[PDB]
Amino acid sequence: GGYLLGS
Amino acid sequence: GGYLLGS
Amino acid sequence: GGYLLGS
Amino acid sequence: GGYLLGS
Amino acid sequence: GGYLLGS
Amino acid sequence: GGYLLGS
Amino acid sequence: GGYLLGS
Amino acid sequence: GGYLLGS
Amino acid sequence: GGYLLGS
Amino acid sequence: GGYLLGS
Amino acid sequence: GGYLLGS
Amino acid sequence: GGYLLGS
Fold first, then answer.
1. Whose CA is closest to K1, among H4, D7, F1, J3?
2. Which chain I residues in 1-7 lie under 8 Å from chain J, judged by CB atoms?
3. Closest CA of chain A from B3, distance in Å
4. In chain B, which residues have their Cβ closer than 8 Å to the Cβ of E7?
5. What whole-number distance in Å separates Cα of residue F5 and Cα of residue H4?
6. d(CA H6, CA L6)
7. Where does residue G3 fall: left (phi above 0), alpha (psi -120 to 50 degrees), or beta otherwise?
């Protein structure tokens, strides 16, 4: 899969 | 605020 | 703010 | 895969 | 501060 | 893969 | 400061 | 591969 | 296995 | 605060 | 703060 | 395996 994070 | 998505 | 994407 | 991060 | 970790 | 953020 | 690490 | 950032 | 610790 | 993970 | 990872 | 530590 993977990941995505932020603000 | 912010966001975090994982697969 | 900022962003981080991983695959 | 790979990664991308920044601000 | 704080921490965030995962996969 | 995965991620770890600390502040 | 802080730290960010991953793969 | 991977990444490590420290401040 | 392994270990991960921090603050 | 902080975190400790073992496997 | 800081981090320690072992495998 | 290996290890990674820092601050």
1. J3
2. 1-7
3. 5
4. 6
5. 10
6. 8
7. beta
Q: How many degrees, rounded to 5, is the angle at CA F5 between CA F4 and CA F6? A: 125
- Rounded to a whole number, what is the distance in Å from the CA of E5 to chain A's nearest CA? 11
The set of chains that have 3 or more CB pairs under 8 A with C is: A, D, F, G
What is the Cα I6 distance to its own chain's centre?
7
- Resolution, given in Å to one decimal, reads 1.0
CA distance J2 to E1: 10
Amino acid at J5: L
Do the Cβ atoms of K2 and L6 come closer than 8 Å? yes
> Residue H7: which residues within 8 A CB-CB, separation 6 or more?
G1, G2, G3
Q: Which residues of K touch L3 (CB under 8 A)?
A: 4-7
